[PDB]
């Protein structure tokens, strides 16, 4: 419970943050869950479209919001099938969430740079031949 | 300027978001800048410690903050060496920024799950043999 489930989730969230190339018995238990993780996500290629847009992970949402949802999963009752789901869903949320929060951060910071150029540096950049000049110098290497 | 620098940054920010394995003439110009990007970051292994802690990318900072810094780079005046820097620095900021903003999001969401277990599911999970039971069933595959 304390540091057995905590350790489970961490593993599953990692493996799932792997699979779709991004950053990041017992050990037996972990693998066994991975497989059922894939076996379920495979069977349901509904692009998990449900949340691939809905919650998307509100920038600093509330656990009560999360809990409020999952409850629906488990409404009827509880079984293992319904549990891997919880897991599979958890990752799918962690994947979007990040992938969708990373692309924006990058954007934000991308703007910041492009701007700083067109505003301060294009003047000077232009007065000196331009990017053709750069490449004339810094091209091929330093040597 | 408009869609020439914009296109430059995007490329450099991408290549730099590559290098350190994460998500994501002219074409000549892009490569030439990449190299000088590496050649500079190589020469200065100061872990770019300067910002690997300072600005770290405040959760929703202000461009005026950014601009306020870079200005210091360019204070004395302007040259190409000082420009790749601006670029190199830009990426280094984009790398931390994300890498540091991703690890947290993951955390936040990791907690949420581990909790939901110890709170709602450990009761039921325990009453049924436990994770040893899971693996008894969902182990090896479905077949």
Burial of A16 (0-12, 13-18, 19+ CB in 10 A): buried
Tell me the Ramachandran region of residue B26: left when phi exceeds 0, alpha when psi lies from -120 to 50, beta otherwise. left
**Residue keyed to tokens 């057995």:** A4
Q: What is d(CA B110, CA A91) in angstroms, rounded to the nearest whole number?
A: 9
Q: What is d(CA B134, CA A33) in angstroms, rounded to the nearest whole number?
A: 8
Burial of B134 (0-12, 13-18, 19+ CB in 10 A): buried
Q: Is A141 on the interface with B (CB under 8 A)?
A: yes
Displacement of CA A85 from its chain's centroid (Å): 18
**What stretches of chain A show up as alpha helix (H) in DSSP?**
2-19, 27-43, 63-74, 80-116, 122-127, 131-138
Give chain B as a DSSP string: -HHHHHHHHHHHHHHHHHHTT-----HHHHHHHHHHHHHHHHH--STTTTTTTTTS--TT--HHHHHHHHHHHHSS---HHHHHHHHHHHHHHHHHHHHHHHHHHHHHHHHHHHHHIIIIIHHHHHHTS-HHHHHHHHSS---
Residues of B in contact with A72 (CB under 8 A): none
Domains of chain A: 1-143 (1.10.437.10)
Q: What is d(CA A31, CA A34) in angstroms, rounded to the nearest whole number?
A: 5
Q: What is d(CA B18, CA B104) in angstroms, rounded to the nearest whole number?
A: 20
Nearest to B91 by CA among B43, B26, B53, B38: B38
Please, what is the Cα angle at A90 between A34 and A43, to 5 degrees?
55
Nearest to A67 by CA among A55, A84, A81: A55
Q: What is d(CA B116, CA B119) in angstroms, rounded to the nearest whole number?
A: 5
Q: Give the list of residues 6+ apart from residue A86 with CB closer than 8 angstroms, or none.
A: A70, A73, A74, B113, B116, B121
CA distance A22 to chain B (A): 5
Residue B137's CB: how many other CB atoms inside 10 A?
12
Packing angle between helix A27-43 and helix A80-116, nearest 10 degrees? 80
Please, what is the Cα angle at B70 between B68 and B74, to 5 degrees?
115
Residues of B in contact with A27 (CB under 8 A): none
The technique is X-ray
Burial of A125 (0-12, 13-18, 19+ CB in 10 A): buried
Q: Is B116 on the interface with A (CB under 8 A)?
A: yes
Q: Is A66 on the interface with B (CB under 8 A)?
A: yes
Q: What is d(CA A103, CA A69) in angstroms, rounded to the nearest whole number?
A: 26
Q: What is d(CA A37, CA A16) in angstroms, rounded to the nearest whole number?
A: 9
Q: Which two tokens stand for residue B84?
A: 């790749």
Q: What is the resolution of this structure in A?
A: 3.5
Q: Which two tokens stand for residue A50?
A: 């449900």
Q: Is B73 on the interface with A (CB under 8 A)?
A: no
- DSSP, res A121: I
Nearest to A74 by CA among B88, B119, B32: B119
Q: Do A57 and B105 touch (CB under 8 A)?
A: yes
Q: Give the list of residues 6+ apart from residue B91 with CB closer than 8 angstroms, or none.
A: B12, B13, B16, B17, B37
């Amino acid at each position: 419970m304390s540091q057995s489930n905590r350790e489970l989730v961490v593993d599953f969230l990692s493996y799932k943050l792997s699979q779709k190339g991004y950053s990041w018995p017992m050990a037996a238990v972990k693998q066994a869950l991975r497989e059922a993780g894939d076996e379920f996500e495979l069977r349901y290629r509904r692009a998990f479209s449900d949340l691939t847009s809905q919650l998307h992970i509100t920038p600093g949402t509330a656990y009560q919001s999360f809990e409020q949802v999952v409850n629906e999963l488990f409404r009827d009752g509880v079984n293992w099938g319904r549990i891997v789901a919880f897991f599979s869903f958890g990752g799918a949320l962690c994947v979007e969430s990040v992938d969708k929060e990373m692309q924006v951060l990058v954007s934000r910071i991308a703007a910041w740079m492009a701007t700083y150029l067109n505003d301060h540096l294009e003047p000077w950049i232009q007065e000196n031949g331009g990017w053709d000049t750069f490449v004339e110098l810094y091209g091929n290497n330093a040597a």
